[PDB]
Amino acid sequence: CTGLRFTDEQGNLYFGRNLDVGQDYGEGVIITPRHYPLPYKFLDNTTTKKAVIGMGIVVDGYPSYFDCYNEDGLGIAGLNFPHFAKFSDGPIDGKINLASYEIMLWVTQNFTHVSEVKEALKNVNLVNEAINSSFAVAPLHWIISDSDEAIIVEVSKQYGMKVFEDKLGVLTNSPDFNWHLTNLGNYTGLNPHDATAQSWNGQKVAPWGVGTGSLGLPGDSIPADRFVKAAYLNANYPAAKGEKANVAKFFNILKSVAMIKGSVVNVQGKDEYTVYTACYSSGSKTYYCNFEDDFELKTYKLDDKTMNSTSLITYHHHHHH
Amino acid sequence: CTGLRFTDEQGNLYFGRNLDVGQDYGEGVIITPRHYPLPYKFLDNTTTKKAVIGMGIVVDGYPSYFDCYNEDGLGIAGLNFPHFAKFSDGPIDGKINLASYEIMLWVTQNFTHVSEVKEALKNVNLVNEAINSSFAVAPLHWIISDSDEAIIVEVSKQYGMKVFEDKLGVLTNSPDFNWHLTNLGNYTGLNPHDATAQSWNGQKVAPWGVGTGSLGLPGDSIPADRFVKAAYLNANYPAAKGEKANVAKFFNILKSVAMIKGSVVNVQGKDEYTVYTACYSSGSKTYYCNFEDDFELKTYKLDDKTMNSTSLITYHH
Amino acid sequence: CTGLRFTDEQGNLYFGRNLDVGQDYGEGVIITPRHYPLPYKFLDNTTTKKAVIGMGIVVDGYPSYFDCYNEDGLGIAGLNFPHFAKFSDGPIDGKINLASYEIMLWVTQNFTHVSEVKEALKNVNLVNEAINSSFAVAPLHWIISDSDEAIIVEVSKQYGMKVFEDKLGVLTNSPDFNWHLTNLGNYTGLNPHDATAQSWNGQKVAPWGVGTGSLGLPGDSIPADRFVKAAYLNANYPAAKGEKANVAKFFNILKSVAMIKGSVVNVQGKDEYTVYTACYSSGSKTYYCNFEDDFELKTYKLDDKTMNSTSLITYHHHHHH
Amino acid sequence: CTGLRFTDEQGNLYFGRNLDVGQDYGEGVIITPRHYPLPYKFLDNTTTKKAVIGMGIVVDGYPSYFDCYNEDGLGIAGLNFPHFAKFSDGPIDGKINLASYEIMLWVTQNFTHVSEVKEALKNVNLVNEAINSSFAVAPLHWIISDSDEAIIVEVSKQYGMKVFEDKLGVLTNSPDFNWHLTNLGNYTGLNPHDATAQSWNGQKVAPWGVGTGSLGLPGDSIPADRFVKAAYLNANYPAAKGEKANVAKFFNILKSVAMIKGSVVNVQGKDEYTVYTACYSSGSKTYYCNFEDDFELKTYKLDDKTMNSTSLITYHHHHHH
């Protein structure tokens, strides 16, 4: 997975992710409206206060999101974090206890600013509890963003719960976020500016085409390598103006770091690849997506009809693997 | 630039390119209909016999294509080939003489199969002659493809005119095609299969996520590096079924190797990037494209109306 | 800097380092004998109880070692750890307080086994105090080894004092040791075994020469990259038999990862390069070394004459930069 | 294999190679004296015009060199060139015909300057014939150097006989020399100067250590990769003064690009590695070498006693594999 966020000069947020998986989930766009039942495994049951859009599955009427965004412009994406994610065996008294899947709606229902999320997370404990006994707990970490800032949330055996500022605007997979941030110092030799003709011991040596300054940028799908490239692209991509250009910029970056079908075969023998790329535009309350086998940009919107539905609105399910 | 071609299991061709440039050409989709006037600098002027679609600019009523495709499913893309491309100073008696820009319509107007093109090229001489005094001659090389095979055409000071089979289905920029083919042998260590946990002197070392077998795959935009990655992705992407899935596969590969705005600044100080990605589907006669600043997939079609137009038709972006 | 240790099948230790620097030190081999004055900033002054050999400089009769090894087979090398090393502003009551430079002789004078060092370090505090006001405090971390095991010692603002088992046998420079260990998982695609001929879409693609399995092994001098390469070479270098073959194996690995003069210019404008490579062989009590401008392998030995000297034995000083 | 040549400011040549192989040869230093029998397959037999030193084997009194250097300062090294090298089926009328193994002594016996070698090579034909029927024909290419210049000689099925100027001072293995020269343009992003602290989307990103400018320099043993690295190191290594410093500079570069034992296993299951590194110093008429299992720098010299011997002079044979 790769998560990405950035804004335009007007404070409009473009935020979303590639989902990179090696099996089917039947994922689809879900709109969760206001006043919808919101049970919790450890907290009091309540109802939704905000409409939410994103991609996920529905289990017994509960929308379990891979990534989702509220009508106020605050979103969250859960990305794979294997060999690292570790949640508590049971709830911890005194904490706000959430089964790990519940963080998606807890963040998007209760807050409009990442600043509020950061403060509340100081007393949150994530529990190794699945939606029901027929599912396994997904090893995930999260990127959360509004138009002002983004944070990363990781819970591990090594470090416990950590919350990091994410000025880079990106996230991938394992290992932990500080490891990846530290890794960027090893790529400071990257330069967008092309090299020029040189003399190596008197032998003329000159570029054959543009791009020579980024020698060493990795193009494989190892999470550390996609992190470096996504951070580098986001750091150097100029500001875009308008909805079309910012959505395009977003898909340009995420499609650059997509995991391409056939290029990764896991130890189980299955293809791992980017099954979808999705972008939420806070300015237009529109969720854009395309899929590995259908490149058409589909759009889904939070509006006065969808936000006030009495039922979940579910769209066509995408199948693969 | 990156050119790409592949077919499905039913013989439908998907063929197109990224255009990676550092200036605006004011390009758009041009449909050249049948019976349109077609001048030649060194041949008898004539008219088009086949309709053609693609991306380019119109210069004094001449459609100058970056890449274009005829109604019979034969196409050609011209990609930058600096420090290498060299064409004749003037026409050479006894040869079919073409100004280099004229190869685009010469190929798409006179042939339906690459086999015919390969034979006719044996007596073609490309000439260093611009469309008019107001334009420079573009240093280009070409990929030409139908549903059966693709060829690469390069004319260089170093090697003269060369025509290669292109089983890999890809082309980028300089150096020459044989140089790139030879480079692939240095990347035989790439493997789509993930690595497994290991012991380094007793220290457990294990992957943190998937993708470990492709360690060393380059992700920068140097032409040699886009060539390796595009070739590797095309070699390992399984067959796709149907128009939607094949167009998506095509765009998945080309967007992976796109040159991203802001990540390349040339020595003249300008950003170089993938301004558009375009795919021609021979089976639907449809040219798909999106642009750096508009990701929506746009479609333009050779149909009985557009193919029989009395005008050039252009669609702007 | 790159530190390296390994043993043969008879328990003989080969341990040493490349010193990679950008300024002159006039360094040379120093034998510190038994019964030599040993002052401490925060402990009772004493005398040496064990003879030590290594490379260093002499400051008012105090031998300050870059790396050193005692007559009982226990050694330590201090390697640069910039942007990370952090020692306490002053001594801490109740701790064994050592100015950071004092760890070299504290370790080699008081112990013969790493197991003892590990236990004693539980109550050690390293202080940011130079040998005198005319010297800066070097930001260092250390590898310590006997014939049974090696440890890494790092003290940082990020993590405080950490002591790691170093099964890999290597150490370089920043960042911290756990970061480098974690980085190795990103290089699991490396394989000593050569690739074979392949078909890419029907195009024959075959190796042009041997070595194809290690595609992606980095050859620059960034510390993370030398760590990966040194760890990989040591992991795959077979056992060697006898003194000459083990010393050669050692120099083969370290010279492979040397920082080559002219290839690195630091931001202060100075060339940084491997000024020397050195190996202590515990089995022969011999320190082997060569230098960037003199490749001859020189030997210096702890014996009954040198170990019982009344004076420091200082061999020729090596000037550079 | 990697070949390297450079000079000091006084016109003294340092020229030699790493021998990287996957089988035993029992190689050793051989001095071929003046007036020694010199048979040719396709030319009249003669005697040696001058003394030569280098590394090789002796076959029925014929010294067959991996690399060799005459007393007048001209040398040649034969390096593996598989999948390319192709010599003629039998001699060709009107040419100076040499079995490919005969070029080593043909060049070093008949010439002092590369300019004269190049002119003579215009009528030379290399023949696919072994020293006797018990040996295969080695698929070699050659680097030839004096103090003024170096050339590469390649005879391939792809290109026929080609002679290239070698300002870079290096040679490795396949593919052909022009391919490698062309490859260097793809590495123009390399810069000895370290990067500086940067801001990636407002996130401070700074080097952890020196060497960041050479991001992307490959460290594996694929021939193209050793060629890039060897060329880059030679291009940037400053001038050295005197015999010791220049010999050290030479060994520093070649040991940096050595093929390390255990890190390359060929498809036949055998280790490929640098069995020796050797350097001829024209100014001292001395051949320096060390070996994978004996790092001592040994010296062998062309002098009044060795150049005038009535018999071939051989030194100890080095076995491996």
Residue numbers in the entry:
A (entry chain C), C (entry chain B), D (entry chain A): 2 to 322
B (entry chain D): 2 to 318
Sentences from the paper on this structure:
Bile salt hydrolases (BSHs) comprise a diverse family of microbial enzymes that catalyse critical BA transformation. Primary conjugated BAs synthesized in the liver, such as the tauro- and glycoconjugates of cholic acid (TCA, GCA), are deconjugated by BSHs to generate cholic acid (CA) (BA names and abbreviations are summarized in Supplementary Fig. 1). We found that Lactobacillaceae BSHs display a clear bias for either glycine or taurine-conjugated BAs. Notably, each monomer contains a loop that swaps into the active site of a neighbouring monomer within the tetramer and places amino acids proximal to the catalytic residues.
To examine the molecular foundations of BSH substrate specificity, we determined the crystal structures of six of the Lactobacillaceae BSHs examined above: four glycine-preferring (LgasBSHb, LaciBSHa, LingBSH, LreuBSH) and two taurine-preferring (LgasBSHa, LjohBSHc) BSHs. We examined the sequences of these loops and found that taurine-preferring enzymes exclusively contained G-V/T-G (‘G-X-G’) motifs, while glycine-preferring enzymes solely contained S-R-G/S (‘S-R-X’) motifs. Furthermore, the taurine-preferring LaviBSH, LjohBSHc and LgasBSHa (corresponding to the clusters arrafinosis, johnsonii_1 and gasseri_1, respectively) enzymes are all present within a single major clade, while the LsalBSH (cluster salivarius_1) stands alone in a distantly related branch. This suggests that taurine preference may have evolved twice within Lactobacillaceae. To examine the recalcitrance of MCBAs more broadly, we monitored the deconjugation kinetics of 5 BSHs that had previously exhibited assorted substrate preferences (LingBSH, LgasBSHa, LgasBSHb, LjohBSHc and LreuBSH).
